[PDB]
């Protein structure tokens, strides 16, 4: 295995990085923790080799350049690790924004109102490697925390009851109403079955998508001599990098859409049955 369709398989690599789980394995050691150029990153059978940016085998016995191949994907390494981190444990929920637009009335018949722009008790975090963030419980608690007594949404947050109605039922992810700077751990839908968390480090668009794919430029150069157009195409292609990507604003879209469409139409979501 010499790599073929280099920019793409590179693509895929980085997609693994972006969703935390990337098999970053140099010879004996399971993750390229320190900058010792990996040997086996399983890109669907394609064992990626950081040694050469290419696959299986190193470019030379020049452990300086070979590590440099490695160093080149400092963006990839950092993203991978970082996304793992956020989707496990990150910047704590220091206070929650919208005072209190929700209620848990466990009073025989469970009066659990969701109103407009709730708030966020929920932290979720954990279990990015294919599990439900909080144990096996994510699934069930989010039921309550969207429809019933929505422990997610708030100010510039989750465009539910205008658009994406019931996140017990509908696919997407739920932003964390938190005073603390952008610690938005977007809990997946109960119906999605597997409830992971994606902390939006800059909160409105997809952001990581450009940022991540852009690191294939560094790939393409020291693999296949020079990065042929790549970003020229990648720039549009992949969801917009705005700001730092460390728990910060971004605002903008989530500022307009999610803020209003949280409620907007129906405004209300309820549960009254003993469950919650």
């Amino acid at each position: 295995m010499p790599l073929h369709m280099i920019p793409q398989v590179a693509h895929a690599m980085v997609r693994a990085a972006a969703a935390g789980r990337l098999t970053l394995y140099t010879r004996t050691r399971t993750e390229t923790t320190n900058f010792d150029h990996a040997e086996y990153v399983t890109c669907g059978r394609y064992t990626i080799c950081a040694f050469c940016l290419t696959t299986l085998a190193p470019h030379a016995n020049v452990k300086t350049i070979q590590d440099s191949h490695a160093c080149s994907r400092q963006p990839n390494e950092a993203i991978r690790s970082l996304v793992e981190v956020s989707d496990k444990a990150q910047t704590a929920l220091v206070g929650s924004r919208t005072v209190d637009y929700h209620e848990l009335d466990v009073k025989a018949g469970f009066v659990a109102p969701t109103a407009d722009e709730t708030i966020a008790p929920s932290k979720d975090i954990v279990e990015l490697p294919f599990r439900t963030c909080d144990l096996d419980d994510s699934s069930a608690t989010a039921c309550v925390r969207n429809h019933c007594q929505a422990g997610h949404d708030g100010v510039i947050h989750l465009p539910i009851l205008s658009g994406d109605f019931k996140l017990p039922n509908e696919h997407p992810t739920k932003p964390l109403d938190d005073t603390h700077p952008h610690d938005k751990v977007l809990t997946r839908c109960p119906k999605t079955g597997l409830l992971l968390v994606h902390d939006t480090h800059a909160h409105a668009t997809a952001v990581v998508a450009t940022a991540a794919t852009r690191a294939i430029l560094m790939h393409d150069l020291l693999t296949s001599a020079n990065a042929d157009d790549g970003h020229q195409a990648r720039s549009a292609c992949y969801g917009p990098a705005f700001n730092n990507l460390t728990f910060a604003c971004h605002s903008t879209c989530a500022s307009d859409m999610a803020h209003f469409d949280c409620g907007q139409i129906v405004g209300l979501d309820l549960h009254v049955e003993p469950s919650d």
């Binding site: 059978r45 294919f130 599990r131 999605t192």
Partner: protein, 148 residues
């Protein structure tokens, strides 16, 4: 000769597949086929999957489920393989990016899976017999599947 089946009744359902990640291989009523590559010359198991995806019954494990090939590497002959203990080796060989995306022509209700090209370098020298060589076909997941 080189391709037989496991027989209904046993049930090897939950098997760990990845790092703390689980799939129900769910072994019972006519589970695909058992590819008997125990010293059956040297070949490349070119698995050409298209059409077939058939999403999990009704699991939100729709995302993260791939068409895969798994070789089974045990000195316990298939008909003896009733619990996890038996397996020796279940090695997931053929999946590549082993998560998922809706490659199925899903828009119109269809569960047509995009054309995949899988490869398993069946070199009998790799193993040299002895723990007789098997393989299976399956929509393998990390994201845990509801056996019930």
């Amino acid at each position: 000769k080189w391709i037989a089946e496991f027989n209904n009744s046993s049930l090897i359902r939950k098997t760990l597949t990845y790092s703390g990640a689980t799939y129900t291989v769910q072994l019972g009523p006519g589970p695909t086929r058992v590819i008997d590559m125990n010293a059956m010359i040297d070949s490349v198991l070119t698995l050409d999957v298209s059409g077939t995806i058939l999403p999990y019954d009704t699991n939100p494990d729709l995302s993260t489920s791939v068409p895969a090939f798994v070789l089974i590497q045990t000195s316990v002959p298939i008909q003896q393989v009733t619990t996890a203990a038996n397996i020796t080796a279940i090695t997931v060989v053929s999946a590549a990016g082993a998560s998922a995306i809706n490659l199925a022509i899903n828009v119109r209700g269809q569960p047509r899976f995009n054309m995949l090209h899988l490869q398993a370098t069946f070199e009998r020298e790799t193993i040299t017999g002895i723990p007789y060589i098997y393989g299976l076909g399956t929509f393998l997941i990390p994201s845990p599947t509801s056996s019930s």
